[PDB]
Amino acid sequence: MLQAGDFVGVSFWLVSVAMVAATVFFFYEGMSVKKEWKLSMTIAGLVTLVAAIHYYYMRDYWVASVLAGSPDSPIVYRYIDWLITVPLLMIEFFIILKAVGASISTNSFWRLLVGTLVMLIGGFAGEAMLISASLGFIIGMVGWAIIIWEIFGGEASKAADANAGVKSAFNALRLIVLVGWAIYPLGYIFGYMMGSVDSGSLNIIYNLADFVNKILFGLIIWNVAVRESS
Amino acid sequence: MLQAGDFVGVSFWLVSVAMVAATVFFFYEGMSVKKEWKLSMTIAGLVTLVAAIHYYYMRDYWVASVLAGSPDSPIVYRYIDWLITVPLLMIEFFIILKAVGASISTNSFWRLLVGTLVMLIGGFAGEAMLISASLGFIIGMVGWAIIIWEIFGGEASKAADANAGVKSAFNALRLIVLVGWAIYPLGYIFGYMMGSVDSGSLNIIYNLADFVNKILFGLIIWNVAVRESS
Amino acid sequence: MLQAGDFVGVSFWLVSVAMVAATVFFFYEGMSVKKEWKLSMTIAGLVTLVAAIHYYYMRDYWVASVLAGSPDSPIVYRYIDWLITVPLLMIEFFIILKAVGASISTNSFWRLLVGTLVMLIGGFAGEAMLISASLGFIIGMVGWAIIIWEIFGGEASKAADANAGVKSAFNALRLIVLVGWAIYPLGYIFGYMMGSVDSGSLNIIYNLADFVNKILFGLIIWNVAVRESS
Amino acid sequence: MLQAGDFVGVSFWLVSVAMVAATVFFFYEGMSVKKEWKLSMTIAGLVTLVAAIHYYYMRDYWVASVLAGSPDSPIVYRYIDWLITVPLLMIEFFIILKAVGASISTNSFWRLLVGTLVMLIGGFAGEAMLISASLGFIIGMVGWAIIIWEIFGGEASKAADANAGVKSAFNALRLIVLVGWAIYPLGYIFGYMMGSVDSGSLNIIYNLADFVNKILFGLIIWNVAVRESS
Amino acid sequence: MLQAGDFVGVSFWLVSVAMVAATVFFFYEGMSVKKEWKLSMTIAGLVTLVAAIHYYYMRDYWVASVLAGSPDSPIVYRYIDWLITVPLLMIEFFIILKAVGASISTNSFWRLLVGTLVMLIGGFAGEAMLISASLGFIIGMVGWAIIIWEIFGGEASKAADANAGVKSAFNALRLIVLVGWAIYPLGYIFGYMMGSVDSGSLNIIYNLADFVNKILFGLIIWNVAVRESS
Ligand SMILES: CCCCCCCCCCCCO[C@@H]1O[C@H](CO)[C@@H](O[C@H]2O[C@H](CO)[C@@H](O)[C@H](O)[C@H]2O)[C@H](O)[C@H]1O
Ligand SMILES: CCCCCCCCCCCCO[C@@H]1O[C@H](CO)[C@@H](O[C@H]2O[C@H](CO)[C@@H](O)[C@H](O)[C@H]2O)[C@H](O)[C@H]1O
Ligand SMILES: CCCCCCCCCCCCO[C@@H]1O[C@H](CO)[C@@H](O[C@H]2O[C@H](CO)[C@@H](O)[C@H](O)[C@H]2O)[C@H](O)[C@H]1O
Ligand SMILES: CCCCCCCCCCCCO[C@@H]1O[C@H](CO)[C@@H](O[C@H]2O[C@H](CO)[C@@H](O)[C@H](O)[C@H]2O)[C@H](O)[C@H]1O
Ligand SMILES: CCCCCCCCCCCCO[C@@H]1O[C@H](CO)[C@@H](O[C@H]2O[C@H](CO)[C@@H](O)[C@H](O)[C@H]2O)[C@H](O)[C@H]1O
Ligand SMILES: *C/C=C(C)/C=C/C=C(C)/C=C/C1=C(C)CCCC1(C)C
Ligand SMILES: *C/C=C(C)/C=C/C=C(C)/C=C/C1=C(C)CCCC1(C)C
Numbered sequence A, B, C, D, E: 001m002l003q004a005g006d007f008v009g010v011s012f013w014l015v016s017v018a019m020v021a022a023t024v025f026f027f028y029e030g031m032s033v034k035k036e037w038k039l040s041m042t043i044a045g046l047v048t049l050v051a052a053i054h055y056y057y058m059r060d061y062w063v064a065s066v067l068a069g070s071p072d073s074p075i076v077y078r079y080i081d082w083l084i085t086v087p088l089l090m091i092e093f094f095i096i097l098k099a100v101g102a103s104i105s106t107n108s109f110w111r112l113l114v115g116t117l118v119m120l121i122g123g124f125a126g127e128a129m130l131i132s133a134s135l136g137f138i139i140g141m142v143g144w145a146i147i148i149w150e151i152f153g154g155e156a157s158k159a160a161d162a163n164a165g166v167k168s169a170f171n172a173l174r175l176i177v178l179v180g181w182a183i184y185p186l187g188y189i190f191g192y193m194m195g196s197v198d199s200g201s202l203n204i205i206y207n208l209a210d211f212v213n214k215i216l217f218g219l220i221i222w223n224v225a226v227r228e229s230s
């Protein structure tokens, strides 16, 4: 059971229920957008669904840990969700371009998918101590650099500028990725490589950031689906 | 297991099952209202769904507490649901205006959403002892004042008076918010700041009030959706 | 685990699974009746759903009780389901009249809903020892008298006689209510006020009676929905 | 946890997951057959759903029993599923005749339903030691004789011969009932009355036979629904 | 709870959540492909669903095992999923040929289904020590040889070459079966009959290979369904 002074556990509870709510929202609304937009909504629901399932597990772990007198929820177990949800979120950049009928190579899809996995496998390997934390940071920054380029100066960026319906959503989502998602590499540096931030602080931040970095991402996509389904 | 003479636990059981029933009702009926009304029904189902999930957790907590000989379910854990359900319920004021094709700025939507979060974060901070209870009450009353103004003298109020289909539902819902929802600030004053009411009494009241403050809210919205889907 | 020779526990298992089956049936078939009939099917599914959820809880309680050497499942916990399912079942009398396009005041709906809650709150208060068992019986008989009058000599009765499609279903359902449902006041008298029947006998009877008093009620409604959806 | 060399427990695991798979299949495909065939598919899904729920329970029981050093899963708990699933399966003989638009009295439906319950109540009473095992066998054989006659020489048999679309499915299903289902009375004789077969052997056989006696039954019905939905 | 440095347990967590995601994806998207393709999508969802349910069980087992100080998850319990999922995956070769309206005997369907079960029953019998591991390998290789022939030189192969829409998917899927699925017989030889590979290594490999051997299989099928649903 969650104790009352435990803000980390409160944050796990909040985000766990938010994510169940988000899942149902995307799935149920996805049934009522134009067919072109249905896949978008599906991906959003999947993202929130994986997160929900994992947060249900992770919250249990935390609470146990707090009863056993040493509260910890290691960042490394986050990757069980990130390995799935982060590639899904990134392919949404391709998917919504397709939905507005932008012309865009499938090469953009693979660039997005590989860059995302390079980024995550680098960090996971570093956190799981399979390789040096420095080497994991570098490999992960390479992945980052690829995805950032795709959506800020690469094909997907250019496709989005050509289309006008998606242009503004694309701009919102790419900002979340640029700025919203910067907490993760920051946690890896200051949390993990430097030890300047405790895991409990990190867990609160990561938990609260999921309102932006996943739910608001999905709601921006729903907003354009619904304006385009008109 | 729920013990004999435990009305608090009985109230948790009643409301927990009511809320599952409500969720399914809104989702299943939402499939059969006009498309304009589908989002309304979705929000209602989400509200009852979050509440159901949380009441399942909270009832477990209570029962444990009663076996351990000190029965308590602190109000603070209510905010895990309120932080999500209360903003959802309030945005229904915007959503149903849109469904009847009222003209209404999105500024009304943000005013509703911010005022609601100011209201709740103020109370949560006060209850979680992050700030003085007095300061949390004041900040929360500011949030309240904003939402009350929106639906009683602000844009949403005026839009609703212009439309005739939603006028009467809008009036019902705004009364629930004005009167039905007054139990919450009252519990904060008499329960928490004054200690004149025990948490067990509060928990019964809050549990029973969810029939009005959430379910009847949703059923009023369904009633207008169905009269307008004709 | 359910032990050998435990017919009470067997009855809980039977009814718990029947009710899950019934729920899915009503929801899945409700998707394929004429729109006029969809709400009926919804209410039936809700009734069986609440019952299923509660029987899952109650069966657990019983089994525990049998391991702890004193087998009891008090009737009072039945009211957690009855408070919801009984009003739902009774409003079906109004709903199916509306579905056949009978003319029927909403006053009939409120009479049904109030009479049902008077009936149950009276009994609950009596069991639960909030008031005398005698007084709870009387108050509950008042509720009964109201609902019986509505469907045997009141508006709903007359509406049903005017319509021919629903006439025969209405007659079946009102007989279940008159006769099928008489076990409940009987249990209160002989079980609770007189002590002439043990709770274990009562629990078997109540469990088995749910085949008639809820499932067959729902199947009669489905049968007319399907003959009218043609 | 399922232990090494436990084939009985392996069989429970296999069948439990098969039955979940079957349920989802029938429900999801039932959404895509002609409306005439939707009820068939519903009944099949219900059958597999009850079985799945019960096998989840029963497998837990077995595993417990094996840890407590005496492995037993008594046949008597099978009746909790059979009492529901066997009547459902048998009414499929009526339902698919209706789906092909055969002319068939509802008397055939009641004959099927009563004969099935006579058959099962007889066996249950015998196994639960409420009556002699001999008497339970006799009463159950009476039930059997009724259903066998209905589908091999009674109205349903004749209706099916008149129709050509269902003729061959009807023949397949009646053979499963004649032959596939003979394991059950055989287990009652050799298992229970004679003691010549242990419950563990019986449980393996019954578990494996559900591939034929329930799933293949449902798949034959789906096969004709889909050839008729063309 | 999943412990630190447990890559086997991490792999179980990853795959368990991936498979839930995959299930929902196939079911939800299957609602939006042409009717010809709906069964394909159904089979894919079933495959991932069984796997998910089993991985939820298996991960629990592993974690227990690691607390009890001897980490093992025997390959034999894999067959509880394989016995169902592998026949399903293989019949997809028939199903998608039907969906593109290829001419193909049902004999191909039975050849696929029998060859698959021969293959698995042989291995299961060998692993469960019911027969020699050698004999189980041989019997299983016979099953393999049948299915490989069907899709590389048999009817299904030839049908697929005649059609052009499915040709390329058929080629992708048959390569996964040829190459992707070779890990399983390899594990049986080197893992089980030779002991050259520990179960923990095997479990990681098998867990990770499900991204290819089940999910990517399903996504290739979805990709052709969606290009053909256009
Ligand atoms: C279309 C509409 C559908 C209607 C669906 C309504 C669902 C029913 C609502 C209640 C269900 C939730 O009920 C219960 O909630 C608690 C906490 O919230 C969950 O949580 C508990 O167990 C899980 C799983 O081990 C842990 O991760 C968690 O830490 C613990 O608190 C339970 O796993 C869930 O069973
Ligand atoms: C379209 C609708 C179709 C729906 C199909 C029908 C669904 C039927 C499901 C009923 C079974 C409910 O099953 C069980 O219910 C009990 C109470 O009843 C729940 O409750 C129990 O465990 C949860 C676990 O966190 C606790 O929160 C709770 O305090 C405790 O009493 C269980 O979590 C649930 O597993
Ligand atoms: C309609 C679309 C298809 C949907 C497919 C659904 C398949 C579900 C398969 C069965 C699920 C498991 O069903 C399982 O059954 C047993 C009893 O029957 C329950 O039983 C257990 O928990 C409940 C509630 O916590 C207790 O009341 C009970 O004493 C205990 O044994 C499990 O809680 C439930 O999890
Ligand atoms: C079809 C549309 C999409 C559906 C959603 C996606 C699939 C959902 C995956 C759920 C995974 C099941 O997760 C878990 O499985 C194990 C066995 O596998 C179940 O089994 C465990 O508990 C039950 C209930 O007491 C026992 O009967 C059983 O003996 C035990 O092993 C758990 O009760 C279930 O929670
Ligand atoms: C499709 C639209 C609607 C979808 C709605 C989605 C709601 C579901 C959200 C999360 C539900 C909770 O999901 C939760 O996940 C954790 C971690 O993976 C599981 O955790 C537990 O599961 C089973 C229990 O037998 C074990 O195998 C496992 O080891 C254990 O940790 C919980 O059983 C489940 O309760
Ligand atoms: C829903 C969860 C999200 C959006 C997670 C995002 C995670 C990242 C963007 C991770 C990035 C990393 C780098 C850029 C380098 C260092 C390693 C990582 C994995 C932390
Ligand atoms: C479903 C739950 C509901 C409707 C909860 C509503 C809660 C409020 C309206 C809370 C209001 C508060 C104030 C007005 C000031 C004091 C602090 C609060 C949060 C108790």
Ligand SMILES: *C/C=C(C)/C=C/C=C(C)/C=C/C1=C(C)CCCC1(C)C
Binding pocket: C082, C085, C086, C119, C120, C122, C123, C124, C136, C137, C140, C141, C144, C181, C184, C185, C188, C213, C214
């Ligand atoms: C599904 C459960 C059902 C149909 C329950 C019905 C219950 C009643 C009709 C209860 C009736 C009572 C009276 C008529 C007076 C005495 C008190 C009651 C509540 C037992």
Ligand SMILES: *C/C=C(C)/C=C/C=C(C)/C=C/C1=C(C)CCCC1(C)C
Binding pocket: D082, D085, D086, D119, D120, D122, D123, D124, D136, D137, D140, D141, D144, D181, D184, D185, D188, D213, D214
């Ligand atoms: C899915 C389960 C099935 C098909 C169960 C079938 C059970 C029977 C056909 C039982 C038959 C019996 C008799 C014919 C007489 C003896 C008693 C029974 C109940 C074992």
Ligand SMILES: *C/C=C(C)/C=C/C=C(C)/C=C/C1=C(C)CCCC1(C)C
Binding pocket: E082, E085, E086, E119, E120, E122, E123, E124, E136, E137, E140, E141, E144, E181, E184, E185, E188, E213, E214
């Ligand atoms: C999703 C799981 C999959 C695809 C499992 C596949 C398993 C096989 C292809 C097993 C093959 C075997 C042989 C070819 C011979 C030896 C025995 C087996 C069962 C390991």
Ligand SMILES: CCCCCCCCCCCCCCCCCCCC
Binding pocket: A018, A019, A021, A022, A025, A211, A212, A215, A216, A219, B046, B084, B091, B106, B109
């Ligand atoms: C920052 C957003 C986080 C949301 C919290 C999780 C709750 C579940 C999300 C469901 C939200 C549906 C909201 C619908 C918005 C409708 C009006 C939009 C008009 C601009």
Ligand SMILES: CCCCCCCCCCCCCCCCCCCC
Binding pocket: C018, C019, C021, C022, C025, C211, C212, C215, C216, D046, D084, D091, D106, D109
């Ligand atoms: C009389 C008791 C009924 C209890 C049934 C318990 C099992 C769950 C309900 C399944 C629903 C079965 C639907 C059968 C429809 C029969 C069609 C025949 C028309 C006369």
Ligand SMILES: CCCCCCCCCCCCCCCCCCCC
Binding pocket: D018, D019, D021, D022, D025, D211, D212, D215, D216, E046, E084, E095, E109
């Ligand atoms: C005798 C074996 C009967 C089959 C049992 C299968 C059990 C586990 C899976 C249940 C789901 C089956 C879905 C089958 C789809 C078959 C499509 C056939 C195409 C002609």
Ligand SMILES: CCCCCCCCCCCCCCCCCCCC
Binding pocket: A084, A095, A109, E018, E019, E021, E022, E025, E211, E212, E215, E216
């Ligand atoms: C290599 C296998 C990759 C899939 C791994 C599974 C990850 C979880 C389930 C993901 C399912 C969703 C994939 C959607 C892909 C949409 C492809 C866009 C067009 C090419």
